[PDB]
Amino acid sequence: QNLKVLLLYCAFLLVMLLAYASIFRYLMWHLEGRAYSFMAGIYWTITVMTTLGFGDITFESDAGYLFASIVTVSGVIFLDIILPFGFVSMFLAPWIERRLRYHPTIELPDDTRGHILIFGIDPITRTLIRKLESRNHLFVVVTDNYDQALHLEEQEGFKVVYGSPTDAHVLAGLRVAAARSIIANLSDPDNANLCLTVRSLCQTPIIAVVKEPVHGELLRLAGANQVVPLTRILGRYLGIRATTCGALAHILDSFGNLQIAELPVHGTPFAGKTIGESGIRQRTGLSIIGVWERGSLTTPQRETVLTEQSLLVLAGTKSQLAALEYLIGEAPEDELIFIIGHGRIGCAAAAFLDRKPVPFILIDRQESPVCNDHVVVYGDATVGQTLRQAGIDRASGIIVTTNDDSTNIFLTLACRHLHSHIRIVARANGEENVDQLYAAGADFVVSNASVGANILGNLLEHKESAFLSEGMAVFRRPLPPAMAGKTIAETRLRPLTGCSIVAIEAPDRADILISPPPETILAEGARLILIGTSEQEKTFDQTIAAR
Amino acid sequence: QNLKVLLLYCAFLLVMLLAYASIFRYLMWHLEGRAYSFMAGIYWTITVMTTLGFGDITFESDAGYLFASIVTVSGVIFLDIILPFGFVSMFLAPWIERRLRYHPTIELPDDTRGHILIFGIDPITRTLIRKLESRNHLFVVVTDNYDQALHLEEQEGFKVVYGSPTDAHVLAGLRVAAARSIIANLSDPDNANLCLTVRSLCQTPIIAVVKEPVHGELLRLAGANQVVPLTRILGRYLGIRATTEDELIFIIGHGRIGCAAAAFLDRKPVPFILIDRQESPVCNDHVVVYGDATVGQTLRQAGIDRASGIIVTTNDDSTNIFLTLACRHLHSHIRIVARANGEENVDQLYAAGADFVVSNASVGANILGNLLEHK
Amino acid sequence: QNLKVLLLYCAFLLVMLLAYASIFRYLMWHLEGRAYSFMAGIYWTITVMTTLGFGDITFESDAGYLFASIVTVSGVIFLDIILPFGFVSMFLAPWIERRLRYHPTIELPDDTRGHILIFGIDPITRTLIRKLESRNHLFVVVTDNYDQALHLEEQEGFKVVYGSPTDAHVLAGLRVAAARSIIANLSDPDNANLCLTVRSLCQTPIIAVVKEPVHGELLRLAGANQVVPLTRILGRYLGIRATTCGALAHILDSFGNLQIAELPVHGTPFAGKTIGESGIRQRTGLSIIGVWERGSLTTPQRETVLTEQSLLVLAGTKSQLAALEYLIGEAPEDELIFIIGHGRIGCAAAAFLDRKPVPFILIDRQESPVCNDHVVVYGDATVGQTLRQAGIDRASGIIVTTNDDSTNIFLTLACRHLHSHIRIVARANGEENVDQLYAAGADFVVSNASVGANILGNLLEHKESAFLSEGMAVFRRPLPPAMAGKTIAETRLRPLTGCSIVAIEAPDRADILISPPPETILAEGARLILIGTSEQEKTFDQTIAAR
Amino acid sequence: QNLKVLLLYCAFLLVMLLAYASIFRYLMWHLEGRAYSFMAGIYWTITVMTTLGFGDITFESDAGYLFASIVTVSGVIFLDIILPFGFVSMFLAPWIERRLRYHPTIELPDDTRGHILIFGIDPITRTLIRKLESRNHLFVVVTDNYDQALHLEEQEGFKVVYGSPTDAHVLAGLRVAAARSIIANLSDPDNANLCLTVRSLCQTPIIAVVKEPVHGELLRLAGANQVVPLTRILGRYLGIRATTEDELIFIIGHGRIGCAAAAFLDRKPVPFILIDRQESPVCNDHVVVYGDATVGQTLRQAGIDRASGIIVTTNDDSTNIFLTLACRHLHSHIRIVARANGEENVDQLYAAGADFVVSNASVGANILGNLLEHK
Ligand SMILES: OC[C@H]1O[C@H](O[C@H]2[C@H](O)[C@@H](O)[C@@H](O)O[C@@H]2CO)[C@H](O)[C@@H](O)[C@@H]1O
Ligand SMILES: OC[C@H]1O[C@H](O[C@H]2[C@H](O)[C@@H](O)[C@@H](O)O[C@@H]2CO)[C@H](O)[C@@H](O)[C@@H]1O
Ligand SMILES: OC[C@H]1O[C@H](O)[C@H](O)[C@@H](O)[C@@H]1O
Ligand SMILES: OC[C@H]1O[C@H](O)[C@H](O)[C@@H](O)[C@@H]1O
Ligand SMILES: OC[C@H]1O[C@H](O)[C@H](O)[C@@H](O)[C@@H]1O
Ligand SMILES: OC[C@H]1O[C@H](O)[C@H](O)[C@@H](O)[C@@H]1O
Ligand SMILES: [Ca+2]
Ligand SMILES: [Ca+2]
Ligand SMILES: [Ca+2]
Ligand SMILES: [Ca+2]
Ligand SMILES: [K+]
Ligand SMILES: [K+]
Ligand SMILES: [K+]
Ligand SMILES: [K+]
Ligand SMILES: [K+]
Ligand SMILES: [K+]
Ligand SMILES: [Zn+2]
Ligand SMILES: [Zn+2]
Ligand SMILES: [Zn+2]
Ligand SMILES: [Zn+2]
């Protein structure tokens, strides 16, 4: 905007130059019978406007004086006044105003498309934003807190809009209809308000983070396409890690056929062994679809070594999962788990452990404003002997789930020092504290930020197949010996049935190929893992054998 | 104004030009016997002060040199010093004091007339302003809160004054004596303070919004022309909509409005149950089933099953929307009447499953509006 | 500071001018054999430095070119660079910095003398400051709150210093030793800290405002020269006004001889009558030393009309005060006073009324964190029927003493409307609310700001005789018939005894002359009122009759 | 730096002068057969670019006019545009970003070495800084509080960094690996967090101030080189001074220090009474006579009469001074030992009537000081 105005002025200056120069030659002729070249004209005009004033070329008539006077003043006005002033107004003012005074972005440009709207900022969404700035996605966070808008503007991995998140006018300004996705991370009532409002304008996909698992249904009603119960999930990931021996934990039931479960390896016979060595698939018929270690989901090799902290992601039938449970295959007696901190997450960890059930003891300073179903031992875990009196002595494991990382680090320190034996699972509110929890003696650390970010992140990237795979199903099929040697693109599987190949594992191998390329040459005995509508799965074995 | 001082300077600059041009000709003639035209003198004076300096016309006598030096310096002082120093100190100064540091308005111009003072801005009075915009009244909102004056400045269909509403000196700078009308929408004690203070200056008509219907008489006594008990009226609208035996009405929210709806249902009478998470600081004539309702089964406990009606009257619109969702979810047909604190939530309450929605801001703005028009 | 530097530069410019001009004439001569006048030199030099460059006088030698080049550049540097830059640094920067950014005054100039230090800002001291800015006294308020320092700096009836009030280093910076007076209006512990610290540096007089009358002694110990129990005093002024009929209230006992008391006129036989008509002095022998009405203490005339709201200031012997009490002279039966608000002031009003005693009832929302001696009826006076249930019906008077003026205005309104008979005394936290309390129906309004300011103000102005009259005594003496016709300056009373004439009243008149001028001619039967040490009062009737 | 860019510009300006002067002579000769000296060319080029314009030397050919025009414009661009635009954008910009808007330091220079990091600034650590000033160490105080960093900026004998003490990236920018020593004066949990974080980067010696003596072992475990239990030590100093039957000691204040003094007196043992206005959030092994003492007769009630000693241990110096006054007033000779949180109140406690004063900041600074010197 400003640049155009600038060298638009430069153009007007040039025209003034040529004009004055042309008039100069004209006057010198018709007024004093003197003839100057075009160059002399430019030369003189520049000499005057610029106030050099050599004086080698001057007029002698009053009319010439009147003209020279006019050009002279023109130079001062357009080179000594307008020019600097305009620079102070077009450049200087806008700079100092927008650097000493926050001017809130209240609206988004009309041409904004495919952007991601973030409502409700916190560690989770902050980490999500930094993570997807590593891909340069257009993020726009919204907030109705002036002070927060400022803080978010000084440092920016994203644009910040300041306005009421639940005002349809404000949502129209954000271009919600043209937006790619929407993260609803406000309170549950505000989320419900947000979803209904957004839905009155568009069908833009919405991912809501629910603070209380019971409200999940309500948010789907208000218009949310996906609901993520973070605290429930977080409590669960603390829980599955607290037992003395890892146990199967169910994840998904794809229409009562394919089951997805996860298994922490600690204290199991699989610890220390390799995937091939443990022979999990041979003895259970299960598919190992991934190994989660060091915050990275890798593909299962046969030489891969399972560590105490490894976590297997598994897929198969109900009986195949029951086989694995038998192999583990039993829990030690008198298991007792202390849970320090009875907030939403600690509360969820308790609920998960009760689903089994494993005996536990909750400990917190004050009564829960949201929970009534749990009996809590009241006291300050930091104040001497509060844990001793609660009988921390016969505990087999501890979950430290305070909302303060330094306190969790201190408790992990003390517990590991007084009980070098028990499992210690700790929670990190921020990732800048994860390593210290390990250094303090924790057997595993669950990070709010990374778990939250990974989930939301994946829900985002796989959006083009999120609402798709939503309502649909994942199933497994023994590759028909008829296609033994044919390429995925050659079989033309999708155009017939409608499903999609998401994995191909060898007959006698823990080695699996995830998201195989069309060029992949199929083999004999191979086991396919497909995904599609609960209609195409039945129209699969039908359409495939037909044509 | 900065325009007058500016062109008044151009005036002085012009006089200086003519003065110097004339003195020029005079010296050229009397000192050196040289005759120059008027244009020549203007041309020379401009040439010197503008520092161009063609040199085609110079003196040769000492007195001429002196004069030439004086004009040169004049051009530097009045064109290269005062002009810019003026520029910056004249209007680049106001810029900082009004754009780098928020400067609240603490007084209206002397001749401000026919304006409507608003005391206590909120959804109702905000809806009032944007409603009578076509009538093009000058609305002035008054507030003793700095941060609020600041926020009311950025976006506007109304002027914002910052000061104590109950201070006589502040009201005089607001020109209350010349105002069209005054809307008192503060606490009842504050309203009373405001009325008596205003009445000591003038008899500008005052429309007071009163919280407790009993206080209506006192506000009149203080000097209010009209008293509007909105919470009673809004409560009545809720109670009316929730009815038109074994009829049983759940009222979620025991604030003033919810309380008024209960009071209304007694007159019928229609059995009802009040539900809140706190005790009423102003009410003690109603029985309230305490315990937060957003949790989940607090309504199930109370028995949202055998009820015939539900009134949602929290002072938070999103909470109202959530409760409406939950209710419509638990019971697909029970009559639900929801309260909307702001008109921007009216549509989401209906979308949530409400059968009727009472809009505080709409009913408020309308009543106050027809009270200003019919005056 | 800046101006000097400015026209110091102007001087250096002039010297440069004369120098270059002198060198010019020199070079033109010894280099080109040309002779120019002094004026031509100045003219040329100005022509170059200023960049006009007529060209009518130029050099032709390389050395001349080198010189012209040097002068030319000198002009650009000292007129086009330094000059504006210096203006931006000496003027522009200091202005924008100290107008967009608060720079705290941390110290006072070394030569600061006779100033008044204010510690602890509030309505009282704010009003005190505005009041004594009407006399242009040098006030300096001190505070350790950054945010408060800013607010006090934007608008200023005084300089503001930001620092710890109880730090001797900070006190030395304030020049406490050279200061006139010090107002200690902090908490009692902070005041005690302040006094001890100030006392370790100087003997500068200190006036402390105590928040709890019991701490008064402690503050005199720490070094305070004067202690003002504002809340006690305020409670008293509410109390003396609440009774159905005004009653004598003791103020000072000057060594068991001269007594000072005050009497509100409401409900007494003196109401409506004039001072002469009531014949108070004739019937009691008392001296009427002042009439306090409409916030102004005037001298008692005989034609002066006493109104319901008038307050007599009286002086005389114990029996003379007892005579007046008899004239009034009795209180109505079943007096019952409701006191709304049990803060420090309301509490003090109760204590005063108990000193008589008059039956009362305290009413407040919560228990007092400081009082234990009073039984309080708990409830919200604003919530319907709280006063009704307390039996406001049989009250003879009400004192409304909430810490919120609007609430006091509302209560005054309602009470006067439901009980048009009872006395209503109300308290104003700020003077901007006094008139409205009257308009609401209050019989009298006690203003914190004005009472506080008047007291402190007087303690200040009369400082030169404050600590003097402190410890001293005020006494009355029947003018000896020996000086019947002599002038105050002629009698030479002070040089003999040491006392001072503060009043002279006629034998048969309520007319009194306060602070009589030395020229005043004394009469016969006149009654003198003097002040001095409890040593000079005895050395009075002795020294006067002797010589 | 702004000096290099500046004189580097003067360098380019100089080259332009010589280039134009040489081109000048070349054109004058080849275009018009006129011969000019080197000084003449410099003199002409300066005369044109500086816009003086004497005119004593002008071209007469078109190509000369063109060249003359080019130099004129060069002087305007490089002397009347870039020079000032530079000025303002070069160093009048930094001025605003560092004087109109506080800019906290979030990172120390790469080569910072031998510095002492302070975490948790307070009277003790503040007294430490002003004490070892003659040794001329570079002390850096770290704080995650903006408003505190701002205040610590105006007055200084030490540099202030703003950031999370327990963030590894923040500690790396603080150059912990190259620091002389680290003083951890935060909460015990925070200290533990700080130690482990620091230990993952380096083995810089750490001196931790610990609140609860039991936590000393854990801080060591985290990685602290030395653990200083000040509250235990200060409490012991109080108890020691208050003694060296029917001996009875009043301890006013049951904070950690007051609590430590009580614990100390048990070992003697010497009978004592704790007096506070609240219950101890960290202690439950002592009986405390509750009820505020500043009111008046709370000490009289308890029996300040038959007592043989008084320890004043509130965490507020003025309150301590007041209590000392009141005590010395009620009893002219009973032994009084007062605690001073800051060294600026030590003298007023003695003036108030204390028999001995333990100075938290002095004892603190001394211990930590001799711990840094002897290292
Ligand atoms: O400098 C001019 C001068 O002119 C007058 O003096 C003489 C002048 O010197 C002669 O050249 C001639 O013009 O006649 C003049 C007198 O008639 C003025 O008197 C004098 O003021 C003035 O300076
Ligand atoms: O404009 C100068 C010109 O000089 C040369 O041309 C001629 C010139 O016209 C004659 O006046 C004389 O000086 O001899 C010159 C040739 O020997 C250059 O050739 C030409 O480049 C230059 O423009
Ligand atoms: O420069 C002005 C010119 O005007 C005309 O075109 C003349 O023919 C020409 O001689 C002259 O040079
Ligand atoms: O992810 C699996 C989830 O399945 C069910 O929803 C369970 O209620 C829940 O405990 C579990 O977390
Ligand atoms: O201006 C320079 C002067 O120098 C000497 O003083 C000469 O005597 C004089 O002729 C000349 O005018
Ligand atoms: O001013 C007179 C005062 O004398 C005494 O100090 C009384 O205790 C007090 O009630 C009264 O206010
Ligand atoms: Ca850390
Ligand atoms: Ca809405
Ligand atoms: Ca008022
Ligand atoms: Ca002190
Ligand atoms: K020029
Ligand atoms: K010339
Ligand atoms: K020029
Ligand atoms: K010139
Ligand atoms: K010239
Ligand atoms: K010439
Ligand atoms: Zn729970
Ligand atoms: Zn009610
Ligand atoms: Zn009391
Ligand atoms: Zn203890």
Residue numbers in the entry:
A (entry chain B), C (entry chain B): 18 to 564
B (entry chain A), D (entry chain A): 18 to 261, 350 to 480
Structure paper excerpt:
Giant liposome patching was employed to assay the functional properties of both wild-type GsuK and L97D pore mutant, a mutation that enhances the channel conductance and open probability, and also yields better diffracting crystals (‘Materials and methods’). Two full-length channel structures, wild-type channel and L97D mutant, were determined at 3.7 Å and 2.6 Å, respectively. Both channels share a similar overall structure and, therefore, the higher resolution L97D mutant is used here for the description of the overall full-length channel structure. The L97D mutant channel crystals are of the space group C2 with unit cell dimensions of a = 232.9 Å, b = 111.7 Å, c = 164.1 Å and β = 134.5°, and contain four channel subunits in an asymmetric unit. These subunits do not belong to the same channel tetramer and, instead, are divided into two half channels, which participate in the formation of two channel tetramers with their crystallographic twofold related partners. The gating ring of the full-length channel tetramer adopts a similar structure to the isolated gating ring, indicating a closed conformation. In the L97D mutant, a noticeable helix bend occurs at Gly92 (hinge 1), whereas a sharp turn occurs between TM2B and 2C (hinge 2) in the wild-type channel inner helix. Its gating ring, however, is still in the Ca2+-bound, closed conformation, which locks the intracellular gate closed at the end of the inner helix and prevents the concurrent movement of the TM2C with TM2B. Consequently, the sharp turn between TM2B and 2C in the wild-type channel inner helix becomes straightened in the L97D mutant. These structural differences, along with the electrophysiological observation that the L97D mutant favors pore opening and has lower sensitivity to Ca2+ deactivation, suggest that the L97D structure is in an intermediate state in which the pore inner helices are undergoing conformational changes towards opening but the channel's intracellular gate remains shut, deactivated by Ca2+.
Each GsuK subunit contains two tandem RCK domains, reminiscent of Slo K+ channels. We demonstrate that GsuK is a nucleotide-activated and Ca2+-deactivated K+ channel and reveal the structural mechanism of multi-ligand gating of this double-RCK K+ channel and a distinct pore opening mechanics. Ca2+ stabilizes the closed gating ring by binding at the inter-subunit assembly interfaces and deactivates the GsuK channel. While both NAD+ and ADP anchor their adenine rings at the same site on RCK2 by using the conserved nucleotide binding motif, they utilize different functional groups and activate the channel at different sites.
